[model samples]
Target chain A: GEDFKIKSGLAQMLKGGVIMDVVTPEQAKIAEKSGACAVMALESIPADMRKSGKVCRMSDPKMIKDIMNSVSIPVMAKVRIGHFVEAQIIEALEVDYIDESEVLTPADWTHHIEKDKFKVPFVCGAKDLGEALRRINEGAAMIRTKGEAGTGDVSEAVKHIRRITEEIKACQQLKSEDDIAKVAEEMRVPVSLLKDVLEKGKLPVVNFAAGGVATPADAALLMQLGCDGVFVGSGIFKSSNPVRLATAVVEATTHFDNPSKLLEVSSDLGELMGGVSIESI
Target chain B: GEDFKIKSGLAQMLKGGVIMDVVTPEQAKIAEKSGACAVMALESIPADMRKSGKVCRMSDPKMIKDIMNSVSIPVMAKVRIGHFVEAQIIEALEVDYIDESEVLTPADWTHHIEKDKFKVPFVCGAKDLGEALRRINEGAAMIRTKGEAGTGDVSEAVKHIRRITEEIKACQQLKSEDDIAKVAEEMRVPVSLLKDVLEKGKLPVVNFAAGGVATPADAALLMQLGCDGVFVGSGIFKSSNPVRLATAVVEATTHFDNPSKLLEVSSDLGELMGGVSIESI
Candidate 1:
């Protein structure tokens, strides 16, 4: 439909902006106050969502509504991977974007939801080039890395980014049509879509860096690593000054190159979230 | 090369027979005396090889020679995965079979040796239908499950066998060419090879069950699961009655369907192997 460009274009419109997660309407307002491009409406902070020792499912729509009701910017609601009915409900409720998230849990003998079926555009997560393009083929308007969420660490995001970058570089270095097709087969995407990546030297859709982003410098680092934008979850709300952190991350994502600008935003207003380490977790 | 028939025929000849692993000439003699159809010549038992923390590679050729020198039955020289030169050395040493084994060490993301290039036939390990077929495509004449070696447990072999069995049945039930091809793509084998599996309702090549055949009853259980034969490793050598265990395993493999025969062979064979348990290892 004519909606393809507009919906996918929404992600392009958000390039170099921060999307922050908040549990309540108050936190949602704080995020919007700090110039977040969008807010993730959730029932709890991403860190507690898993630590609560329970099954992963979509949060209550009432909570989603409370956050969306308070925020002026577009508010994103999440659905479990492959849970299309939840997407339908989110669509019914008119949330701005539906994140087919892995942070909660996953489903599938069927892998993922068909995003095109809904009028609301969707964002899906990937940690590899094939996976990102595969999501795009499935009608996702946006893609972000499903890094080690809630750890407030960006290494996995950077790790996956570099890994995908390497694969794309390898794909681009394909010396012939047959070799390219063979690689496309290995990646499990169509030759055409692989060509899409090879021709552009990146994914055809908007790609965002996500997870483990704990500081303004971290967001700036991710932007420098070639992501169009950054999505900060635990890095924002878990900090002492949620508003200040959100503002800093958004500013860092935008002026990711300027050392002076990053230095100004990196100044501390309060305590920082002592993130969980990788080994013990 | 007067190939195909006699090469593949080697595996069929070993059907209902037990292949035993032996570390030295003395151990090799015991296995042959106890009626092993073939003996695996290795530098160390599977368990110690990993415990050594040394890189996994083919053991000394001198050791292979000493074992082969003592054995009248077919002697198999094992090599790291994708080490063609080691395979060449085994061929030069005139071993009857080359096991492109995972029990030793692995090499070349060129995942496995191109076994067809050699005169001595190759047996590769796999835990699923696609993997088995992929090995076959790479010119392996025979296939076996790479069960949790050295643990002296039959569960992993049984698990892989059942899993592959289900995949075959599912392939057999495919509704159309397109669906079958899609599944073939998922399995990473060509459609024709997948069709080979579908047509016979099993692999067209000889398939053996290996790893963890610790007791006579365990060997019988594996055979009844539709494997052509069994491979006995630490189960035989590590037990108090090595010869008795070897004899019992062979009798059980040949008469796998007979509960009474299994009972007779399973009788007090001295002290049984105190196999490694799954956890706390």
Candidate 2:
């Protein structure tokens, strides 16, 4: 409760950059070299997990540790929602951030981790202003869209980000301050932070677009939609030209408003991950 | 062979139109109602047949006939490459056209149908100038790219169309008419037909783009790249909003050059068919 600034400050450093999922030390190195602000150390990327149709738990501590050691930049790992023990283990390993991720099978369907209990920063998934504020109220340092993951289709991610931004705009336009409580009650978020959103005309915490981001254009579109950054799960490494696509996505994320740069990066980047359709998920 | 213009003339009517794959009479009626120029009658869409992992033969004549009766517009059916018997069966049903399709399992890898022997026009697939010319020389009245079918990825179709058009421009630049023989040898087509392409600066027959179109944008994209029309093999019917998507694709095809019209049709169309990664296939 006392160190809100420090935890969110760490996430702010990653603003205007990209985070990539990396399963091995090699991939971690690739992410770092490609200008990613952080690498999400994990046992399997979402595409593989979706195909296996098995329970996806947190990465083995040893594997996460190896990724941490391999990259100078921050290393983040996923834990099942409500699995504080896994978050504790990640914190013990000296990782930079913990994602209470929906990509992993949920440990508790009705609840999420009490992220305030952890000193390390926690990121969580959300679909709209309500979800984002709920996660932030529970001590999440960062929020990302719960876009249909593992599909290369970017439509869901676009939908989620658009929805949240539109909702935030609606909140900002409220005629009376007294309306905040009714909106907060509908959103299931604390009234204080929802008021903060209205004051700033945006989310109080850094918001990144996540899930189903496959191409440089997809990354750039989210950035243009007002994401602070992006998280690419399986798009880069799954493509035929991983190194090129990785660099392109990173470049696009950094220079999202620049059409010439987007054109330069998007051109001749080989095949993207053959994505599954969004409906399949 | 002398009836080339007669068969090709029929295909010209479909220019600036979209053809949809329809497995059932209900789907056929939907396609027609949605403004599709023709319905490609089949037992299964490519997406389903791809998952089944069995030989995709031509649809039963009875099934094709049911679709034919349901739609007032032309009905076309597919035959496995080089499968004359399947072609014969479809022709006997009095369908308007037959596609010697690569979407079906190839009955003969080295040769396509002898379309000159059939009264109905045949459409075939090509990846490049050599393949397109070869199919045309073998009496194909229409050509579409052999894009990775059922994947809902449009890049392959875009690549094929761009390649063919670029090659045609290359052909038109030849200084000596005699040099046509060398180019024909490279494409393995008759020198005379290659000369016709060079003189016309496009394929002698109507060319459509097919196999991976799943959205209005996809249809409009190929049309912008200079396809005469488009064939949607599995993108519709498998999608969540088949009726809406079908209508949108037709609208996009007809108004391919109009960005505002494309924008109008593209809005609010629901989930497309879940596509497999192109590499996975």
Candidate 3:
């Protein structure tokens, strides 16, 4: 429980900041310089993941190691869903965090890594509170909305954040704690955690919006929707101007409530990432 | 010339960071913690400029001092375009930078500040190469694209950067030194500086994109267009989440080359500053 508080505290500090997806040490450095709270180490960004159309798995340990060495900020790496070995490998690399992600090809469609076994913090993606609670039960310290990754279109991300928030509001209105176990069984989460969610009317850990965020407005939109933070993959490097976009996004997130400043930063940004539509994917 | 270079060098160090607009010491602190490289102390943002429909002038000395004390980073104050006395007052305050800004009503239509008279650096707005060169000739240490302020539209900033770049490219193509001097006279800048522009194909000092930039993409776009940095105003504090959006824009500017990172920071941020159109202003 102390570990949960500690790990979740780290995630809490990342609240309202962006976590960037990076592939190389150079990219990792760029992420840190751009004011990212953390960098996600991967073999490729989600855009590349979709483009390659190959089996996606955890990144090589050496590559993750190189990234870790490159930046003072926290480093996170991905593991295939249900593959604890990949998670173990990532933890052995001493990554600050692990993401049991659906972006990679799922190793087992019905199950995920037992995140409680690891000392490092773990994050998992979910489309709704049910899925988020399920991952939290498995010891995920953070949860994010699983919008279609690699798509520059923000509609999916918007939908997910809205659904989760609405679900939490609905949960708070429920009359009985006795109903939690039945709900937990259906969601595949522990009754204890589910009870916490019902009482708090939200996840116990940080919840970020992910997948398909492509503009500063989009980033601010999710923050307004009450997501703790955001996760970006394939949107930065794929844009016409990555450095400018990166910095702009950071400022936008920080000043989400300050419309005039947002206007100043969001204006005149040229071409954005040309992302595939969800249907195309 | 050495003094000019020395003053402008400080601006260069802020190349990838956002310069936020703040009306109060508290707002200035928010700007700094949100990762602004500098703060622009103003009595009111552009939004108020439109709403109040009053003569906009330099901020009070005590207000600027409060903001300067609130943050470790540089503090910038606004002077009316061509108001040397205001410039002198701001310089006396020991503000790190002075912006001979068009955001405030101009004190003189024809004559601008003789910026070289002061020890402090000056930044002035321009919409084209000739305007930029003229400001530079007036001893401005920095140049920014003068997009229509108080408007959230980025098109003006985009237009200015493009026009400046195109004119510079044209100047660089001129073959005769004598022809450069003639053009320099036409542009109202020193022959030596025009020659430098021809050779370097860029401004002699740090050229930031300013005015109507309101989002992360806008900041990134200016950076992509080859401007050294950005200056933000009402677009920040006017928004719904000033702290979150300010930081996001800074991140976007620093990591402009990374799309996925941009995407991450750009997602789910809500309510941008509602802005007037350029035509309305």
Candidate 4:
């Protein structure tokens, strides 16, 4: 193991900021200039991936390399669920983080990658507490909500966060940690991690919001909902003004509690992204 | 001037606050309990008025009296624009303020009521600087954006605020107060008043946002746009939970600069009002 704490420590550095999705060096530069904390290097962003309705795979190391060289911030690349080979290639490239993302087609349906096998940190998506801690137990250094990718709606993301938060609150209400044994047993995760959430009122590791984050307002809403940070790619590049959208979302993430600041960022952003709904198209 | 300054002064007591619309004594009590700085008493709330498409007149004195008796905060009532006699009726009721409203069918298109003729202060709606100052000169102590009422969308409100703010900025950049003479001549407002806005960088009187504000986010958006306060009747009562929506919107208006506060208020409110669009029905 590459010291699980060290892997998560890097992600901790990204707290309260935005991670932009970019397919090319051009967008990468715009993202960095707009103040994104990191970049998700992808050859096919979420919108295009959803539209293709075909296999989603890792970005060619070449494109990821190009994006990496373009931006000063951390560069994260994705691999298919259970695709250790793709992870190996990215890790060889010395990518800052490897997201075993659901945004891509899964290489194996039955199992996820053996993340501990790699030195690089792993970020995985979870829909609930069971899945989140399961991934954590599997060595995911960071976790994000597995909100439906590519639809600019944040409803599922909201539901996912509420479930995770409420489930932890449910754990805390029990009279004893001994009572958590049954809930943890039902969830197939360690009672230890559940207790951590009960004690802290938050996740043991950094939690980011992903999927369907389409506007600066959307990002701010998620941050206020308790996400440590957010992941947004198509929301920026697809808007009427990428520079404006990108900058506003970043500002909103940092100033999520300041409605006055939210107002300053929310205004003047050109038309928001009309997130792609695969069926409608 | 009947002390246009005093009339404006009462509206100022409502700065950075929300004025909710209430149709009954019950709703008026709820508005006060939920933190509204004032209540707009009406027989038909905006959505219903849009549906009737009939002549919308002032509420009966009995109903206005019921609301006034129910709430500790200021109580306001609307009269058709230019209907001085209806204004007189409501003013005689000793209502806290009167809105020379366009939300009601205009009683006289050629002219607005001579607000200075009465002791009660009047608030009016305007789309741009010319209209705002024209009303101000006519003794309208307060002005609101004439956003299309009952739609819940803030697009028109945003445009209205930008137009008024930009026009004031235009005045500020003028070479001299004497240069404002031509601009003032075109707007049909006094040069002295235009000079006041130029030197002060904002309206010479209080301005609130009205029409189409349905959610906490929408209220926060308007507050961030520089509105001194807001007016909402339907957005609250029409939502799934009036208490939640009412409290959230009031908090958002005051904390418009605070996204965290906006987030707190925006969450847990029952479904937001799906504002009526006259044509859609």
Candidate 5:
């Protein structure tokens, strides 16, 4: 709350695409210490599922608890779908945020609870405005449309953001929360979500963009799309200039409307894996 | 008992990827009717640990009982590694096979089964041939080397089968049961295993190739590598031509020595997710 002077929707941390590239709690601490809106402690950093096809191993609560103990930035972690029991455990841990991450194999369990049952909020993946709207109906606090995560391809991300941005914009001009609520109701998401997006002109919490977000431009594009924040995953750490890129991304996020700054900060994320870019594309 | 011979070693089953994939009783019937060494009915399907990671979402005994009733093959199932309470209930189910599947999420309350206490045999996955031998020393009736499953990669299966075959072959040349027993003593495996393999000319039970085997060719290769059988998940039904490929793979298991007979079956395990070859790659 003190950091951004804004209560962001999600704690966006973790990068994607590269192996062994999650920002350490040390790094997460940097985000937390440096006034990051929120910090997500993830196993695979943060990346997309389709391109990498690599999954972060299942989360271990003990480890999650350890990370949770390390930071006060509403710690967030990801798990597969239909893992309600695991979700129940996460709730017990009192994590501030949970994402039904699609980076791993999904599940087949039925009898998932209504979102109202969960005290802590959940975020899910979507592919377009309609899908994100659907996730909203399911009571997901926010939605990240599916994209090419590790490949660093921004094509999918651009498509999703553009679609969602247009939809929410159209929604905001409406006189009645009724239309938004109707969309949320049909989406089976919380009604407040539509109102939240309609009023704020964005999803309630951190509506972030991930999957192949390697450059400051990528982060800027997301902020431009009205995402409260962005998840870099491998993009920041797995590039040629991690420290520079990381700092640059933070800058671009804060000042996305400026393109020259985006170019100034767009370097590689790190030196790992022979300094593979978060995505080549 | 009548359809398939005990074939020397025990046939053990545990639920994870393979058993859970056998969703329908009809599928269970296929496994049994098609001469599966035995069937393990399980709740979660194991896939790629780093990818499809699974947790045993506890199974209903009623559902287990139903599966048992549907197939004549010995029915086996698994609980979490240290779930003593669930193990006790499983024992009550009269399940013929009790696999202490490490693949299931671990539990905190108790130690893994003292296999000696269970009347039924327990099967477990060992990462290497040495691990397999270790489990056998711990009184596992039979061993399945933990070949990577769910990836549809045959590397682990090939490595385990090769390692065990070489070890057993060297033991066979010892010329006496006592000499073989001495080798077992050296390796710390049960002396009974040495004696059985020496006398019967193979390990007491048949070896099954697992992990990443999708098509008949993959099965045929494992059989060629001298695996006794194969366990498949997402391999058959996940393919477009499940029945055709399942039959072909089954035929391949027995026709390793006869290329002519193998050539008779026509099957194709179609692509699963477009980029990934549906047949075991």
Candidate 6:
């Protein structure tokens, strides 16, 4: 097994940069073999999470297992917040990456687990850096600005991820582990761990700008802002040509500076769904 | 101590012509004195046979205790089915009767206790003489037919109870006591117990008809059918006056011929909601 853990999450996945949001195991496999660094596996959140008190009706556990088995590349799965048990159960099932994404409401009142205990790294959603910091303190391996998960409207997200990354990088003095630790500690979690997580060249909190990730331009925008990776929840599935969009997103993540590549990928995104995005809970 | 057990069930209490449906302890107390025979107290599913699981939210032990303190009429309280631990708890709280009525859903596959286990009698609900026999076989002290509960529509219920009573009585003339004893013996039931339950100079089935029993006339009709009692859910509460209606129902249970006296007492049932009706689940 490769011991070289990508401390630099975004760069690594986008290294040669091909990371795609895929809807199925076959697409994920295709993405993995075709230069994609990592694959964001699609999940049903509101429909799955709201009905948490009862037996789950969405996302077969077996399907998740099969996807994990079929892909050698890192397979990311998302669990709703407060669904710690669901997340924990999934982790125990040997999934490589878990997203403590607030793609769903929590079912109970348990505090998130301390980050170090997570056997596999975790990525959590945050609206702001402070929230990202909190997620890191709680053992999140990465932080992503949650804009419109399962909705392809990447506007607010693109703006937010850009501004935050710029603000943090410009204030380079704040890059010290101590300053990072201070912010993490204020979240009532371990600052040392958060600092280590960041030192790994991870997003200041491992920003994977998600929600509304529709076009190649959005993917390029997130990559340009120093985001480690971007998660496209519904953008890929809702688009008319999901495969082409996936190819575009993967192309943009790597060739972010290539304008021609960006335009080619942009118009290729999809049709049918309004640019308004998918209906997220 | 009278060395006698109160045959109580809230649904059965309603069926027994002993108390009014949705009645207050004040009305129950008056009913206890006015010839209700016994008084059953409850939150929703009457004093006996309330089951565990969903639907019926049970009374807190403290609340059952408070009610036990308030009434002198062999105060009956219920715990839901499968809430045997709760039943044990209720027993410790000193309720005079435990009906095992199955008014609520059963929590366990293990079937409720026969009458022999607890000091209190288990008055259960049955739909027919066979069901009554089954419960009796299970050691229920007595059986009341489950009428259309909560609807305040008592006509069909009255007919069912009348039919069961008639069937049990008809068995007497067709078979000798020795023959009945032999049958009861083959059935593993104490012949004397069956005989005592049937010994009353009335119907063979010790029945109480309920469901949609609202007026004093409704209570009077069930009692006239040789029902040991009547269980009323919404009857008293639906009438404009619950206390008056309860008093009338109680008096009517005892004095079927005295409509005039029944009407006088019937003036007290205040603000009644008729037979046990619950809003949409």
- Cα deviation of B116 in candidate 6 (Å)? 20
User: Clash number for model 2?
Assistant: 1
- Measured with C-alpha atoms, the lDDT of residue A40 in candidate 1 is 87
- Which one is best on lDDT? 2
Note the DockQ of each predicted structure: 0.01, 0.02, 0.01, 0.01, 0.02, 0.02
Q: Write the residue-wise lDDT of candidate 1 on B210-240 in tens digits.
A: 8766667567666666888888876587778
Using all chains and alpha carbons, the TM-scores for the candidates as numbered come to 0.51, 0.54, 0.51, 0.53, 0.45, 0.46
True contacts kept of each: 0.00, 0.00, 0.00, 0.00, 0.00, 0.00
Q: Which ten residues in a row have the lowest lDDT in candidate 3 chain A?
A: A51-60
lDDT minimum window of 10 residues, candidate 3 chain B: B272-281
Residue A260 of model 2 has an lDDT of 52
| Lowest lDDT block of 10, candidate 6 chain A | A49-58
Which regions of candidate 5 fall more than 4 Å away from where they truly are?
A1-23, A30-35, A45-57, A109-113, A169-206, A259-264, A267-281, B1-281
Candidate 4 chain A: 10-residue stretch with minimal lDDT = A51-60
- Candidates 1 and 4 compared by TM-score, better number: 4
Model 2, A1-281: lDDT tens digits are: 45988999998778998999999999999989999999999988898887788999999989988988998999999999998898888888988999999988899999899998889999999998888999999999988988878876555776777788889888788786678888888878778989888789888788998987776766876776689999997668877889888998899788876655665565556555666654434
Worst 10 residues of 6 chain B by lDDT: B272-281
**Model 5 over residues A62-122: C-alpha lDDT tens digits?**
4566566777656777755544434544566667777776665443222232444566677
The Cα error of candidate 3 at residue A177, in Å, is 81
Give the alpha-carbon lDDT of every model.
0.78, 0.83, 0.80, 0.81, 0.58, 0.56
lDDT of 4 by residue, A71-175 (tens): 889999998776565575567678999999987765445568789888888899998888998999888989999887888878888789889988878767778
**Ten residues in sequence with the least summed lDDT for candidate 5 chain B:** B272-281
TM-score of each candidate's B chain against the true B chain: 0.95, 0.96, 0.96, 0.95, 0.73, 0.71
Alpha-carbon deviation at A43 in model 4, angstroms: 28
